[PDB]
Structure 1
Amino acid sequence: SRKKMGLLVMACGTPYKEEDIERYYTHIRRGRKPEPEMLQDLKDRYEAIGGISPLAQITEQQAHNLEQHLNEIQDEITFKAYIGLKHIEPFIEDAVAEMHKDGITEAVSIVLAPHFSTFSVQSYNKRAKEEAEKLGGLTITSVESWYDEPKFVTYWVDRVKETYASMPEDERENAMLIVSAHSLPEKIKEFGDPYPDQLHESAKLIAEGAGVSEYAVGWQSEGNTPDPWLGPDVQDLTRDLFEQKGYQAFVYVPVGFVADHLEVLYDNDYECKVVTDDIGASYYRPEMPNAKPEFIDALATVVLKKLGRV
C-alpha cells in the first residue's frame, strides 16, 4: 500500500553528558584534544546555559516529530526517521548503515541547516551518498537548501513582529535587526559557494515580511585559522552600528541555526548581550524553532516539495 522511505535527518551533533565534551571537541578540532583549561571552560559554558542534556534532545525530537507529521499529512509514503550526526554518534555513516540493515531502499535526506554551503551541507550529503554507494541497494535524494521555504520565513517573520510589538516606543523607533549565520572561511568564494548570498536573501525576506526597514547581516562563531573568515562578526557589528547611529535595541535572528546549542545560547545570549549591556541597549533574541509544530510543518513541506508531491 504505502511506499516505505527512509528520512535521513542530519545535524552537527552535541555531547550527551559532560564527559563527552573531550571527544566531541577533539572531533571538531580534527584530532587535536583540547587543553585542560579549554575543557574546564567548556564545561563552565554548558553549565551557564542550563546544561548539556536538554540540548542533546532537540535533534531527536525534531526527527521524531517530523516523521510523525509527514506520515499524518499525506497518505502515499510511510517515512522512518534516522539521525545522522557530523561530530558524535550516531554518525552519518551509522545512520545509512542502519537504513540498509532495516531494508530501506529509497530515502530522502535533509540537513537541519537552511543554507547550502560547500563546507557543511554539501559535505553531509556527499558522506551519506558515498556510504549508500558502498553498501549498495539504497539511493538518497538530498535537500540542498530550504531557507526560502515560505513557511520557514514566516516562522521568523512572526517572531520578529512580536518582538518589535513588545518594545517601548523609543526602542521600536531606534532598533536594529541583525540577521546572522555561522561564519566560514572567505576562501569558499573561490568555489562560488552561495552561502553568503543565501544568508543575505534570508535577511531580506525576514525583514521584508516583518516590515523592518533597518537591518544588517553579520556572521558569528568563526574559527581561529589564519585565513580570513566571513565578517563582520556580530559582536563588532553591534558596536559599530551603535557608534554610528546610537540604536537603543538590538534584535538578533541567528537564522542559520535551528536549535539551541552553545553557538546561540552563548555566542548570542552571552557574547552579544555583553556588548548590548555595555552600550546600554536592550537585547532581544527570539526563540529558536527547535521542535515547535510550526517549524515541523515547514520542514515537512520542504521534504514533500523535494519529492514533487506538493
Structure 2
Amino acid sequence: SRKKMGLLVMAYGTPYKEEDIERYYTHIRRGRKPEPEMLQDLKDRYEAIGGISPLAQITEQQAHNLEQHLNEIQDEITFKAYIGLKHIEPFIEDAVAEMHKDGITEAVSIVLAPHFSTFSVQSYNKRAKEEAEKLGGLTITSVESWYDEPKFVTYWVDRVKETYASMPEDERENAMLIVSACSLPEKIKEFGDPYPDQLHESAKLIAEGAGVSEYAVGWQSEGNTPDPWLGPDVQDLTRDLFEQKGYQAFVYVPVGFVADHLEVLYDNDYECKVVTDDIGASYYRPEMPNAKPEFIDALATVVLKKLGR
C-alpha cells in the first residue's frame, strides 16, 4: 500500500582513507593536484583530528538513520536512501542513475547543508535533476534550504544553552557567540544569493532562542582564489572582538556544517582554539548534529514538509 520514493541525500563528500586525499583535493581544486608539501600537510591535519575513516561514516549514518526514521514516523511512503556526493564517489550523477536502475520513479532530495547558495545547493540540485531528465522516467523535488526548521533551530539553541550553563559565572557574563558557515566568493552577491542573509538569520534565531544577547556572524574555511571571499574569517573576528571588548570565552557554532569533519575539527577546534588560547579566553564548540536522533527528526520533518505531509 506504500508508495516507493527515493531519498537523495547530497553532501560535499569526504575521503574514505588517507590514499584518497590526493584525488579528493585535486577534484576540489578543479584539476590542480596539490603539491607534495600540501599533500603532507593535509595528511597530518587529518591524523591530528583523529583519523579519516570516521568522517565518511557520518554521512552514511545520517542517510540511513534518516531513511529508517522517515519510514517509521509515517505510513504512506517507503523511502530508500541514496547518497550523492560532490567531490568523491558516489557522485550525484551516480546516485541518480542508480535510483533510476532500481526502478525509482519519484524522489525527494535534501542537501546536508542548511543554507541555500547558488554555489553549492543550487548546483547540486540542478545536477541531480539534469541527470534525471537525461535518463527520463524519474522526477525529483529538491529541498533548497532548511536552516529555519524549528527542530533544527531548537537543536542548536539547546546545545548553546547547555554550553553557557556549564560556564563559570564570570565567563557566562563575558562570553561571545560566534555563529559561522563555509565562506564563499563574494561574487555570488551578483545573483542576489541569499546565503549570507540566511546565515545571519540562523545566528539571530539561535541566539534569540538561547537567550544570548552578544553574538556575531563569521565565516571560515574559505578557498584560495584571487577573488575576495565572504568575511570576516572566524579567526580575525575572534581576535578583533577580543581586542575591542575583551571577551573571556568564545562559543563557536558552525551552523553551516552538520558533522564532525575537517572544517570543524581543525578549522574550529584547532585554528580558533589557537587564537582563544593565544588571547587567554576559553574555547567552547557544541556537539555537531551528526546522526543524533534529534537531528534526524528535524531532517525527517524537513523532508515531510517539502512533500506536503
Question: Normalising to structure 1: TM-score of the pair?
Answer: 0.99
Q: Separation in 1 of the partners of 2:225 and 2:53? A: 30
Q: Separation in 2 of the partners of 1:148 and 1:221? A: 23
Match of 1:67 in 2: 67
Match of 1:225 in 2: 225
Shift of 1:228: 1.0
Shift of 1:22: 0.4
Shift of 1:13: 0.6
> Where in structure 2 are the equivalents of 1:168-207 lying within 5 Å?
168-207=168-207
Match of 2:27 in 1: 27
Shift of 1:223: 1.2
Shift of 1:163: 0.3
Q: Separation in 2 of the partners of 1:224 and 1:295? A: 32
Q: Separation in 1 of the partners of 2:57 and 2:262? A: 14
Shift of 1:107: 0.1
What percent of counterpart residues are identical?
A: 99
Q: Separation in 2 of the partners of 1:111 and 1:229? A: 22
> How far does the alpha carbon of each residue in 1:16-48 deviate from its partner, in whole angstroms, 9 at most, with x for none?
000000010000000011000011000000000
Shift of 1:302: 0.2
Shift of 1:112: 0.2
> How far does the alpha carbon of each residue in 1:188-233 deviate from its partner, in whole angstroms, 9 at most, with x for none?
0010000000000000000000000000000001111111111010
Q: Separation in 2 of the partners of 1:270 and 1:21? A: 20
Q: Separation in 1 of the partners of 2:69 and 2:135? A: 29
Structure 1: stretches of 5+ with no match in the other structure: none
* Corresponding position: 1:15 with 2:9: no
Q: Separation in 1 of the partners of 2:195 and 2:134? A: 29
> Where in structure 2 are the equivalents of 1:1-310 lying within 5 Å?
1-309=1-309
Shift of 1:278: 0.2
SS of the equivalent of 2:13 reads: coil
Q: Separation in 2 of the partners of 1:128 and 1:61? A: 21
Shift of 1:56: 1.2
SS of the equivalent of 2:6 reads: strand
> How far does the alpha carbon of each residue in 1:123-169 deviate from its partner, in whole angstroms, 9 at most, with x for none?
00000000000000000000000000000000000000000000000
> How far does the alpha carbon of each residue in 1:225-279 deviate from its partner, in whole angstroms, 9 at most, with x for none?
1111110100000000000000000000000000111110000000000000000
> How far does the alpha carbon of each residue in 1:273-308 deviate from its partner, in whole angstroms, 9 at most, with x for none?
000000000000001000000000000000000000
Q: What is the RMSD of the two structures over their aligned residues, measured on CA atoms?
A: 0.4
Shift of 1:102: 0.3
Q: Separation in 2 of the partners of 1:98 and 1:185? A: 33
Q: Separation in 2 of the partners of 1:28 and 1:238? A: 28
**Which region of structure 1 is more displaced relative to structure 2, 222-231 or 99-108?**
222-231
Shift of 1:49: 0.1
SS of the equivalent of 1:32 reads: coil
Q: Separation in 2 of the partners of 1:225 and 1:28? A: 12
Runs of 4+ in 1 over 4 A off after TM superposition: none
Q: Separation in 1 of the partners of 2:223 and 2:18? A: 22
